[PDB]
Every structure is written in C-alpha cells, then in structure tokens.
Design a binder for this molecule. Structure first.
Ligand SMILES: O=C(O)c1ccccc1C(=O)O
Ligand code: SF4
Length: 304
C-alpha cells in the first residue's frame, strides 16, 4: 500500500547502501515478503544467502532459522528485528532428551527437523526439512531412527519410509497446524473442484483427507502441474499471500485461519528499526557453528 511507500523507500536505500540482503520466511506478513529480496523456507533462505555478495543479512523469521543462516554464513552479519521470535515446538526438545534417547536406542540415528535449536543441531546425526525428510531417512542405513521435534512429521516419515520412527519429545507438535479434519469436509462441499494441500506437520486425519501433503516449498510448485482454479491451503496464513503472488490466476483459500504469533512479531516498524540500528546481530559460539554445520552439510551431501 502507498501509505507505507516512504517506509519502503528507506528500507530499499539502506539495504542497498549498507549492502544488506533481506531474507523473509513464507510465514512473514505480506508487507515484509514484499520488501524481501528472497522469500521461502528456512533452508532455502540460508542456502540462498551463501550465494550472495551482500556481507550483511536481515533475516525475517524466527530464531532457529536466523541461526541456521549464521551457521552456514558465519563471517556474515545476520540481524533479526525481534530477538524473542522463536518456535515453541523447537524449544520443547532439549540436549538432555536427545542424550536420554541416544542411550536407549544407540543404534538409531538422530534425525532432527530444521525446526530445532542450534544446540540440539550439534547433537544430531543429520538435519532434514519437511520437503526432504522422507528421502533423508530413506537414505540412512538404519531401519529405526530417532526423530524430532515434530511427532506428526515423524509419523508421516514412518508411513512413507516403512521405518520405525521414535519421536521426541513426547507430544512434540506445531500448534499452528492442528487443523480439524471436518474443515476439509466443509471446503469440499463448498468448493467441489478445489484441491486441498496441507503441511505434513498437520495431524494424520487431515493429511489423509488432503489431495496433497507437502512443505511450503512443495506447495508453491503444485500449481505448476495442477491446473485447478482453487487450492485450499492447510498451513500458516502467510503462505496464502506467497501463493497468490506466484499464481495470480488461481484462488488460494485457507483451510482455517492459522497464525504463528512468533512469525507475526516482525513488522515494518521493527524491521525499519533493525536496519537503522543494524541490530539484533545473531551471535553464536565458534564451537556451536562448527558442530551444528556437520549434520546440515550431511543433509546436503545425502540429497546431492
Ligand atoms: O517450510 C515449511 O514448510 C515450514 C513450515 C513450518 C515451519 C518451518 C518451515 C520451514 O522449513 O521453513
Ligand atoms: S508455524 Fe509452528 S513450527 Fe513454524 S515457527 Fe510457528 S510454531 Fe514453529
């Protein structure tokens, strides 16, 4: 909107002037997606940052993602506008629980979802995303794996791979994606020709009623091969804007309104403040960077 056109102009000039690149997660408000150089998922953004000349990064998302970017770009300054933006699911897994479960099942590799603390990543055998988790677990020798922090994704991986997936912590889940299956019944009657796409973080009954299950990266490729005029989307509300932007010819309908409060902590105002003050810098110990990079590079190595 034109009322913010002077705010946007100061963001563009400062970003240009100080050599920032702005990376925004798909769950950011539309206003921040519209000012970002690249919008996508966590790993997509971090990988993207490795490729660029900009020595400074403004990251718009939540803490474990900004740290991922820093882990993989450690000589680059990474700032976030709100340091309290975090992932409640990720924060429920701890080093202690991982260590507890490694002892119980010492032959099982620890596969950690990218939505995990940096400290947790130092202890994982490999990282995955919702896009590549099935393939990653498939390529591991073992037929029993330890997986966290999301139980639903773990269970999905178990279904797709046929392997035993021991999920940690107990009842690990994303509250944003706990859609109700009756919501799918309801949209099918309302839009009989619509396709339902939901995230694998969604519970089993929702995944099973959906036409497609995939990551937000996967969602945004579906209309390249599906010609449907209407898609119903089971993930965080920010993806609707992303999808509408990429495919203006289609209609994107939320399965339900689902908002990640932590993702919405970032605003045009605090983003502007961040660029004015070049704060808040993501600072990690060298040793955590060194150790946590290992399972992240292995993920890339395995998928290569
Ligand atoms: O990308 C996704 O689908 C996604 C959904 C929820 C949280 C985190 C991510 C992420 O990997 O960035
Ligand atoms: S949508 Fe769920 S998994 Fe993603 S940052 Fe928010 S609470 Fe975490």
């Amino acid at each position: 909107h034109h009322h913010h056109h002077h705010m946007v102009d100061e963001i563009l000039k400062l970003k240009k002037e100080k050599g920032y690149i702005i990376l925004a997660h798909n769950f950011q408000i539309p206003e921040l997606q519209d000012i970002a150089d690249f919008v996508g998922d966590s790993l997509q953004l971090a990988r993207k940052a490795m490729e660029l000349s900009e020595k400074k990064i403004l990251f718009l998302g939540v803490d474990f993602m900004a740290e991922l970017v820093k882990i993989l770009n450690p000589d680059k300054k990474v700032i976030v506008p709100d340091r309290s933006a975090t992932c409640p699911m990720a924060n429920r897994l701890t080093p202690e629980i991982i260590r507890e479960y490694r002892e119980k099942f010492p032959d099982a590799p620890v596969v950690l979802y990218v939505n995990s603390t940096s400290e947790c990543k130092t202890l994982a055998d490999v990282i995955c995303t919702s896009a590549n988790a099935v393939e990653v677990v498939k390529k591991l020798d073992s037929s029993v794996v330890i997986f966290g922090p999301d139980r639903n994704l773990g269970e999905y991986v178990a279904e797709k791979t046929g392997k035993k997936v021991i999920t940690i912590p107990e009842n690990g889940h994303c509250p944003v994606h706990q859609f109700n299956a009756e919501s799918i019944d309801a949209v099918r009657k309302k839009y009989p020709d619509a396709k339902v796409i939901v995230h694998p973080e969604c519970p089993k009954p929702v995944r099973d009623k959906a036409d497609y299950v995939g990551s937000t990266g996967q969602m945004e490729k579906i209309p390249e091969r599906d010609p449907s005029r209407i898609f119903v989307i089971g993930t965080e509300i920010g993806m609707i804007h992303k999808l509408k932007k990429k495919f203006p010819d289609r209609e994107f309908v939320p399965l339900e309104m689902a908002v990640c409060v932590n993702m919405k902590k970032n605003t045009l105002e605090n983003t502007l403040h961040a660029l004015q003050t070049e704060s808040f810098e993501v600072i990690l110990p060298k040793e955590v960077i060194e150790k946590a990079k290992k399972p992240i590079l292995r993920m890339f190595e395995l998928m290569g």
